[PDB]
Amino acid sequence: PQDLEFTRLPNGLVIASLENYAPASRIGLFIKAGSRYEDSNNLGTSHLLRLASSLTTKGASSFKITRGIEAVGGKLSVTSTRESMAYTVECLRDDIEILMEFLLNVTAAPEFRRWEVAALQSQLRIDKAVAFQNPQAQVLENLHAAAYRNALANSLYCPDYRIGKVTPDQLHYYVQNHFTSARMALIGLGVSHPVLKQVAERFLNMRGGLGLSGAKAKYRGGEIRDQNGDSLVHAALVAESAATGSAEANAFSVLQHVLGAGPHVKRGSNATSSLYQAVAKGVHQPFDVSAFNASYSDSGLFGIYTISQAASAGDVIKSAYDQVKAIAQGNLSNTDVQAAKNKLKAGYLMSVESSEGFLDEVGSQALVAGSYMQPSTVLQQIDSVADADVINAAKKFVSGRKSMAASGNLGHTPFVDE
Amino acid sequence: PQDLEFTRLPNGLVIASLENYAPASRIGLFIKAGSRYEDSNNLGTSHLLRLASSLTTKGASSFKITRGIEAVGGKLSVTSTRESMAYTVECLRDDIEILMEFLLNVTAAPEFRRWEVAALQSQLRIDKAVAFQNPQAQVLENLHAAAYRNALANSLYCPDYRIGKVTPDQLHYYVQNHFTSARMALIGLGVSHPVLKQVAERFLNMRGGLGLSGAKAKYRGGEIRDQNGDSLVHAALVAESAATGSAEANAFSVLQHVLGAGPHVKRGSNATSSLYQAVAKGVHQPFDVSAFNASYSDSGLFGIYTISQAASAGDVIKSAYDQVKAIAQGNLSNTDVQAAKNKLKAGYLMSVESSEGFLDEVGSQALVAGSYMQPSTVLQQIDSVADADVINAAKKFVSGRKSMAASGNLGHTPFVDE
Amino acid sequence: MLSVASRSGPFAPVLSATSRGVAGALRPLVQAALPATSESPVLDAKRSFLCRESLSG
Amino acid sequence: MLSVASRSGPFAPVLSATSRGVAGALRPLVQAALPATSESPVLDAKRSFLCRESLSG
C-alpha cells in the first residue's frame, strides 16, 4: 500500500517517499556527479569527495558528526558510479529527524579546511590498494580507458601521480558546479511526504539550476595489456551497444541471459549457459566465462569476460567468441529465449526485496527518466522483446569495432586484430 | 697504416685488430644478446646480466676483479642495445695482458652464487630510477611496445613486478644459449693480431655454434598514452621502414637529414631544418622537433619526435606531419638533397675519430655483416642515393600504418586515428 | 530507465563512517571458485569482508 | 651494415665498475634548451653527469 508519492519542485528537485510501517527508516540523496564529469586537470577530485563526508561543515564539526550519529546507532555511507553519487542515512524510526539534519550539512554546506584535506590525502592510497586486491577492478578500469577517448574513460580511483595534490579549491569548485537542485533527487523510505518537503526547502538558496554540461563520450577502439605476476589471465572484449532506456537496450539484456550471466546453483556446472558449455567442450582445465553488460545514459558496452590459465587463454577467448557468431547467423530457439526472460524477470524482482535495493532503484529512475514505473510495467517490456531483436543485437556485436583489456602472463593471449 | 686485420676462426668467431702506436689499448667483446632474445617468462634477465660483471667467477673472486683492475688504473664497462651486448676493457699498453684475462673470466666462466645475486636485486631499482629521470627514456620504451607484438617490444630495463625474482638458474640458462662463439666478435685496438688469437683459443671448449634462434618481429600498430605530472608533452609517431644493410635504408638516412636530425650551431635557430621551420611558422612558444630513425636487423622505424607544451601539442604534431606530406608528393630540391648528404657524410667520419667510436663501429659491422668496409666505400653508397628514392621513402611513411606514444598532460594530444 | 546494477557488470565503490569499503557487485563472480585453486592472498592493508553488513544482531 | 648509433635514435644503457651509468645517445637532444625553461629536476637518487668521462687528467 501507499505505493509511492512522486513530486517535482519548481527548482527541479525530485522528491519521492513511501510510507512503510517498519521500525527503521532510510533517507537517500542522489546526485548527477562522479568521475565522468571531471577533466584532465582535476582527475581524482570525485574520489576524494567520496572519502570526505565526515569533515567539518558549517552546521556541525567533525567531532559532532561522528559522535552524534554513533550515539543513536545510525550509519552514513556514500556510493558512486561513473554517472552518479548517493548519500545514504539509516537509523530507527524516532531518530530520523536529527540524522536528516546531518545529511544536509554534508552535501549543501561543506567546508574544506586546509589541514583536514591535507591529512586525508594518504587515505586515497589505502582505499585504492584495498580495492585493487581484486583483479577484476583494475581490468575494468583499463577497459573503460581502452573503449573511450573521454568522459567515461576516467577511473573511479585517483591516479598515482595525483595523490597528494588535490586542493581545497578544486573540491569547492566541483561541488559548486555539480551539486545543484536540478541534478538531484531525495528518496525516503519510512518518512511521510510532508516531512521531506520542508527538509528540501532548506537547500535552495544557492544551487538553482543545471551546473555544467559534460562532454559526450566518443568511442575509441583501443587495447591495453598489463603484464604482471598474477597466476590467472583476466580478459575482456566488448563493442558499443546502446544507451539505457531504449528498445535496443532490452534486447541486449535478454541476450546476456541467453549467453550466461552468472550461476544459480551452488557449485553447479551451469547447464543452461551456452557460453559455458561451448568453452568446456575443448578446455579441460579450470576457467570461468560470462557475458558483460554495462549501460550508461548516452552509450553502452557489451561483450565477454574470461578467467583462465596462461597457456589456455587463447583457446578460451576464441571458443567463446565463436558461440556468439552462431547466434548472429540465426541459430536461436524460442525455448532458450523464454528461459532467458524468466531469469531476467526473477532477478529484477529479487533485487528490489530489501530496503537497500529498493531505494537505489527509485533513485536511478528519478535521475535518468524523472519518473517512477511500477515493476508490472517493467515486466511487460521484457515480454515484448522478439526473437528477431535478439539476433539483431548479436549482429551489432560481431560486426562492430572491438576493445580489449587483459592482465596476467600474456604470452599466449591474442591481440585484438588477430 | 696497418688498417685492419680480419679473420674468421673455424668455430665462427670473428677477430679484428688494428696496431696503433698509442700509449693506451682497448679490447672489446661483442655478443648477439640483449632484450630481444628473452621471452615472457624471463623478462629482465639481460638487464641483471649487464649489472653483474664484477661477481665471482671461476678464475677470480669478486675481490680480485675490483682490486686487480684498480691497481693499474683500468676500466671495465658493459653496453647494451636491443640486439647486442659489448664488454670493454681499457688500460695502458703494458698492462693489457692481465686485463684480457679478467675479461675472459667474466663472459666465459661466470658463477652466479645465491647470496651475491640476491644482494644485487636492489640495484635494478636504483638503475632504472636513475635512467627514468629523462622523459625520453620511458617514451621510447613505450614506443617499442606500441610498435611490435614481440621480440623488439621488450624493454631494456626490468619490469617492476619482476624485481626480486630473477633467479640464478635463469642467468645460467641465458649465457648458455646466447653467449656462443658463432655469435661473438673480439676487437682489439692496441694489440697485435697473434696475441688476440691465442687469447681466443681459451674460450672454445664449450659454446661451439649457434645457440637459439629468436622470433621474427611482428609489427603492431598500437598506441600507449601515459598521463602524469610532467610540464611538457613528449610524443612520437612512427611507421615501419627498412632493415639495416639495404639500399632503402640509405634513402631513409638521407630523408632524416633533409627533415632535421639535431642542431649544428650552439643556440642556433636551425635554419636548414625543414621540419623546424614549418612548425615555427604557426607556433610562437618553446618547442623542439626532430626526425627519428631506428634501424635493426630485420625491421626498422622512422618518424617524428616533438616536445611541446600541453595546450600547443596538437598544433605541433599536425604541422610537422604536413611537412612530410609535401616531400612525398614531389616537392624536393636537389640543393637540399646535396646539403643533406654532406651532413650525413661528415657525421659518419666524426663519429669514428675517438677510440670509443671506432671500436663500436668495427664491432657492429662484424656481427651484422661479418666483414669490414672502409669509410671510402660507405661514402660512395651515400652518393648513389637518388632524388626519386628520397621521395619514395617519404611515401612509405605517409601511407603506412602508424604507432604512437605520448606522455605528460594529454588533454590536447590527438589520438592516432585522428 | 534502470540502474547500472540491474544490467549487471559496471562496478561501484562505497565508503562508510562505521563500516568497510566495498568494491563492485559481480566482481567476485563465482564458479571460478568451484574450479580448483582460487586463493585470495594475504594482504598488507587487509580488510574484513563480511564487514558487519550481514550480522545477526 | 652499421651500428644503431650511426643512424641515430635508438638508445643504449651502460654500466661501469668505476664510472657512472649513462642512458642513450640523442635523448638530451638540444634546442629544447635554448627555448626557455627546460629544468633538470632535483633527484632522490642523484648522479654525476659529467662523471669523469671528460676529465682533463
From TrEMBL, chains A, B:
Q: How does it sit in the membrane?
A: Peripheral membrane protein
Keyword Magnesium present in the record's keywords: the answer is: no
Coarse class of the protein's main subcellular location: mitochondrion
Q: Which residues form the Peptidase M16 C-terminal domain?
A: 165-344
Its GO CC terms are:
mitochondrial inner membrane; respiratory chain complex III
The places in or outside the cell where this protein is found are: Mitochondrion inner membrane
Which terms in the Gene Ontology molecular function aspect does this entry carry? metal ion binding; metalloendopeptidase activity
What UniProt keywords apply to this chain's record, in alphabetical order? Acetylation, Electron transport, Membrane, Mitochondrion, Mitochondrion inner membrane, Respiratory chain, Transit peptide, Transport
Domain Peptidase M16 N-terminal intervals: 15-160
Leader peptide range in chain numbering: none
Q: What Gene Ontology terms for biological process does this UniProt record contain?
A: proteolysis
Matching InterPro entries, A to Z?
A: Metalloenz_LuxS/M16 (IPR011249), MPP/UQCRC_Complex (IPR050361), Pept_M16_N (IPR011765), Pept_M16_Zn_BS (IPR001431), Peptidase_M16_C (IPR007863)
Taxonomic superkingdom = Eukaryota
Q: Which family does it belong to?
A: Belongs to the peptidase M16 family. UQCRC2/QCR2 subfamily.
How does it associate, per the subunit comment? Component of the ubiquinol-cytochrome c oxidoreductase (cytochrome b-c1 complex, complex III, CIII), a multisubunit enzyme composed of 11 subunits. The complex is composed of 3 respiratory subunits cytochrome b, cytochrome c1 and Rieske protein UQCRFS1, 2 core protein subunits UQCRC1/QCR1 and UQCRC2/QCR2, and 6 low-molecular weight protein subunits UQCRH/QCR6, UQCRB/QCR7, UQCRQ/QCR8, UQCR10/QCR9, UQCR11/QCR10 and subunit 9, the cleavage product of Rieske protein UQCRFS1.
Q: Output this protein's name.
A: Cytochrome b-c1 complex subunit 2, mitochondrial
User: What lineage, starting at the top, does this entry show?
Assistant: Eukaryota, Metazoa, Chordata, Craniata, Vertebrata
Automatic annotation (TrEMBL), chains C, D:
Q: Where in the cell is it found?
A: Membrane; Mitochondrion inner membrane
Enumerate the transmembrane spans.
none
What does the similarity note say?
A: Belongs to the Rieske iron-sulfur protein family.
Q: What else is known?
A: The Rieske protein is a high potential 2Fe-2S protein.
Q: What is this protein called?
A: Cytochrome b-c1 complex subunit Rieske, mitochondrial
- The organism of origin for this protein: Sus scrofa (Pig)
Q: Which residues of the full protein are shown?
A: 1 to 57 of 274
